[PDB]
Amino acid sequence: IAVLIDELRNEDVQLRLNSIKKLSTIALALGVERTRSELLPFLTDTIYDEDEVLLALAEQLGTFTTLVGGPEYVHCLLPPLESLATVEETVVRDKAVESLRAISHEHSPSDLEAHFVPLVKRLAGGDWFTSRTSACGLFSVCYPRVSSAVKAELRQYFRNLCSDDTPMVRRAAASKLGEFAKVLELDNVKSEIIPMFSNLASDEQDSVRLLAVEACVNIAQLLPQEDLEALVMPTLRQAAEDKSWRVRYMVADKFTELQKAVGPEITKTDLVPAFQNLMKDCEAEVRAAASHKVKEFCENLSADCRENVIMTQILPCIKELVSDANQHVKSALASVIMGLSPILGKDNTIEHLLPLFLAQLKDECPEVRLNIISNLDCVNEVIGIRQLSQSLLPAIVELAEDAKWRVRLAIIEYMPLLAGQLGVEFFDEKLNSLCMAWLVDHVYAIREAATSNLKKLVEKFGKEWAHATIIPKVLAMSGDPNYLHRMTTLFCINVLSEVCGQDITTKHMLPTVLRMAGDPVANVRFNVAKSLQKIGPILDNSTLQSEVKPILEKLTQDQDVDVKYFAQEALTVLS
């Protein structure tokens, strides 16, 4: 009610949207009678403003059927939509188109013939390529239910769009072909779609050609497994070795979608060789695109000649994409290669796959190893344990020393997950100096997470090991001539005492803390006081009275206020 018809003319400000496109409430109060012969006409030729108002309007009108009267008057909605379906702005048209399809199911079959179809034809025939690219998306939805003769006319108007003066509309049409062929009858896919397909399949512009591939997937699935060779296959086979990488990039990328869509056997004959070439493409981002689909491509090879083709055909190629000159190609493989284990068995994974699995692991490229470290999912269950250690030493050592702070973060971050899969045995001498050269790390969040490392390792390794290996070296920091490192000793203690029991905190840890309370640098000293308070609730009734209390007391008499304060409060937090 209130603010309404007056608010629809403002100054085209996004303050007049909050309530404008709330038209679901306006037309509910305007009544069905008025809404139709008043609101709709208004909304047809009064407002055409910004790409944000119109895009809200296009959306709205696709929800106006039960509000303009019902399915009987849906046709009244067409004009304000057929209008919007013409705005230069792509995102408005697409919504108009999206909303025209929704309401096109609300028409009776008769109303489609009377109204919808004429609309389509005025768009399709228009001078504005904008009008025309909107038409392409509307054939599929009014086709199945219109008359036998109307269908016939609709295929012309499409055929026409397929051969447009403007590349924008051929692209449009290409991209809508597979959708449209799906509601056609076979008689016409074979006769009328295929030629149209054939002609975008091979087109000056590769922007058009590039889009033939997904129609190729779409048309294949329609055609019986015995026509593909005559109709789909020469195009597909040509698209694969196409002049332009943009096109070949498509086939590689939609390859596994192309394999099932084409059938078990045709895969064996045409696809497997055509897939070897993509893996050997001169353009790199094609080789990668095919590397990403290698592992799927093998899981869908018929359940018998798997062992065969994977061994005889795929594997030789894989052996090269490992030795590839490009980081994106290798890193693609490193993140799939080892899913070949379930299908090759166990004898062959040791025979051929491990030479491969351990080649990537020797790679100097950081991103490569990470992925190979990250995938111990289906290779953890099949292959050995001590095997990994051969090149997992340099692997885990170089990664932790990578010039990129945020790679180092990763293995640090990984370390707690490498306990439930490598245990007390693997973690040894030449690896803990690693887990602690991180505490002296210049970057900050690495020191943060490398301390988080010891608390996560403790919570996974009881309180036994700590006293033996770690703590001896954590305290071997309280001696560093650089005060920032002495400090690390305390922060490093402050988190272990959490999960260490009363024992080890009082015995090997405490005598160190008190001993640092004499640091010539003030910063350390107040961190002593702060550190005693985190380790408060853990100690004994008489340990706190004997050795902890008499230290804070001498700390209070400090020529550096900071020390007395954090130490004043320590005394108050623990009596």
Added chain:
Amino acid sequence: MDKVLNREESLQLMDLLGLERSAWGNIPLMRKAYLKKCKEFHPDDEEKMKKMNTLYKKMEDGVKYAHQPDFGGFWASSLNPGVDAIYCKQWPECVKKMSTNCICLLCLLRMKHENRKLYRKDPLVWVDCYCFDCFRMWFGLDLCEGTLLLWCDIIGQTTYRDL
């Protein structure tokens, strides 16, 4: 440009120039590829020699309409940019979600477009407009530092049109 010839002609004229069929819309290529076929005529098979003509003359005029300004000029202009003309002025910026306190041909033409599209209910296309967006639209081209070089290789050869 879509309005210059139709598909049937479009391809024919491109064949009679021995020009990669993909290059319709590139006026300066087409021009010079025709000034190169004419060097193979006179006392020079010959039925093509006057066909390339009939086609090419029809396109020269269609293109002359494409270059007519809106409203007949009622309601920076010499010849070919040349010298140190400034086609872009920062790579991503002038092109992407622009930062616009400049007048580089890219930013000028872009202003020209969003100024004309105010009174044109019509959608604009290549050789009506000449802005990057219209170009990148016509050929099938991806927003990249290659595509800019291609565009401003045709602009460097077009005579100050729409300024």
